[PDB]
Amino acid sequence: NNKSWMESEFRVYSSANNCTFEYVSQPFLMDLEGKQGNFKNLREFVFKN
């Protein structure tokens, strides 16, 4: 469409309402690359509330 791989179908939520706050924080990048072979990165996350 423009060039190379891109994300074009954002099908997460139909509507956003009653917003409280929003961040544009900096990367977990990562990219849109599609290489193969062994899984070359390991990411671990812990979520607590």
Next chain:
Amino acid sequence: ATRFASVYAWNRKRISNCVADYSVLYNSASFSTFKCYGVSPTKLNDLCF
């Protein structure tokens, strides 16, 4: 603001997740009116809202 809406269509902006400091403009006396009804013009800022 580069543009202001009419009184019947007053524009609203929500403020959240930040620190509110307006002493820079309060002391300049650059506003024809600074009416604070039932609240001190400066001490209202010394609290978490």
Next chain:
Amino acid sequence: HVQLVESGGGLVQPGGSLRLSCAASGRSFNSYLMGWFRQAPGKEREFVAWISGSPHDIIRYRDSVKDRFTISRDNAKNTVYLQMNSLKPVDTAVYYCAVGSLRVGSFSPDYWGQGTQVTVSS
């Protein structure tokens, strides 16, 4: 959980003062407004007064009772105070203590107590 407990009820003469206090426990209410409502038996509970827990405490009263049933509160104890002054028989009612939040600039009760009977008779 949050509970409201009243105290100080009874019956007072027309023109005789009184005080009703309701303590609020469970959580903190510094962002809330401490208030009271009264329900004359056989009628709909009418506002009395509310006070905010802020450095610039805002106070509202009810038309029939404005400037007569003084209201105050405590932030450390989380309690609401209602000092009734120079009453008349029309003031007979069941007084409830309300704990709420300021939504759109209007006192919006969230938690309610069990109430207490404050009567005025000749």
Next chain:
Amino acid sequence: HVQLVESGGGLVQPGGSLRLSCAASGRSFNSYLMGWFRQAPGKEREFVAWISGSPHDIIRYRDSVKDRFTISRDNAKNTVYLQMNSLKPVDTAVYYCAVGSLRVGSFSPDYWGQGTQVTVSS
């Protein structure tokens, strides 16, 4: 010496609700029937309701007070709670609490209290 003490009376305009309570002390009331009686000024005393303290709660009401007055008891505190709903001016009277036995299947009061005034008027 068995003693009964009433509480919860006052003035309630028509359409309101009230909670009358009586506490009994002196001896166990497991085998006793606990009920309420009322007597309006200028009129003879009339039976209101009674309830049993047995595990199976046997409950009764007078014909006029069916579906509008409710009576309950707590054996742990030896206390009886009476709910007034949809009160009318005809309900103005002095209400008493009675402790009695079940003789020939009829509630027979044995101990009486002092009574509390319940007035119903605008």
